[PDB]
């Protein structure tokens, strides 16, 4: 290429969007924004493919341009806007509030939230830096730079912030015995307690996470998101509690539901 790419093919799109193979040649290329395009839902897929509120992309444009959709309390008219993890989407016309939270199988589950939960959000802080005449700044996972934070907040901690002010309400420290969720890799979408973190200087440090049913797994620091203090989460969880079931248990639950509901 001679410059940045502007298109995206459906088969080269991320698989968690669950796009078809014969609808088109092109997938929605997400605009640049607070989330990576590999790790986001564009608003067209959420409004059209998930919620079924629109049948075509023209109807998505027609809904967004009438100023009904808010992301983190801000009206967005870009239909390919990158919406990511812990993300609050408010539709005030229908009176609906959703959070984008990862599903157990690695996809973005649409999790309807009670409206007073839609006032805050959780952010994983990416870096700390002191600049411009001794003022400290946080940078979080969704690129919200917050100046003058609490001095006890370090990197890999999480913060609960109010969406109307953008200012920190209260934070969770990254430590063992805390509740977290996986945002990347093979174990994506699983919720469990941090057992220990092993250090590998000059490389990736590995975290071990134990499930509520005694299932242990591991990831990297780049794929951990602390969501609770201790065991109680600071957010509402999806219909599955983040427990990965094997295919045998999924089959057994499916046959049980078939037997119960006929």
């Amino acid at each position: 290429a001679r410059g940045p790419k502007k298109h995206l093919k459906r088969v080269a799109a991320p698989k968690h969007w669950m796009l078809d193979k014969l609808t088109g040649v092109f997938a929605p290329r997400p605009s640049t924004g607070p989330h990576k395009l590999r790790e986001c839902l564009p608003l067209i897929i959420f409004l059209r493919n998930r919620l079924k509120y629109a049948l075509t992309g023209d109807e998505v444009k027609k809904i967004c341009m009438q100023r009904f959709i808010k992301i983190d309390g801000k009206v967005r008219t870009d239909i390919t806007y990158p919406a990511g993890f812990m993300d609050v989407i408010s539709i005030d016309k229908t009176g609906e509030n959703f959070r984008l939270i990862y599903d157990t199988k690695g996809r973005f589950a649409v999790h309807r939230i009670t409206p007073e939960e839609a006032k805050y959000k959780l952010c994983k802080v990416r870096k700390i830096f002191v600049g411009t005449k001794g003022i400290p700044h946080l940078v979080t996972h969704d690129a919200r730079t917050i100046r003058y934070p609490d001095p006890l907040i370090k990197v890999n901690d999480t913060i609960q912030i109010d969406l109307e002010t953008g200012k920190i309400t209260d934070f969770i420290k990254f430590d063992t015995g805390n509740l977290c969720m996986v945002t990347g890799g093979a174990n994506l979408g699983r919720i469990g307690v941090i057992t220990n973190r092993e250090r590998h200087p000059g490389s990736f440090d590995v975290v071990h996470v134990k499930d509520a049913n005694g299932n242990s797994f591991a990831t990297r620091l780049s794929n951990i998101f602390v969501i609770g203090k201790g065991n109680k989460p600071w957010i509402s969880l999806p219909r599955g509690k983040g427990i990965r079931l094997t295919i045998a248990e999924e089959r057994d639950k499916r046959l049980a539901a078939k037997q119960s509901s006929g």
Binding site: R147, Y148, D150, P151
Partner: peptide
């Protein structure tokens, strides 16, 4: 906005120096 936020963090930093002073106190004293 800068004046009030800087004054609030100035209160926070004077606080953080106060508890830093006391933590230094039981660390040195013991």
């Amino acid at each position: 906005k800068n004046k009030e936020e800087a004054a609030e963090y100035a209160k926070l930093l004077a606080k953080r120096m106060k508890e830093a002073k006391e933590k230094r106190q039981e660390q040195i004293a013991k």
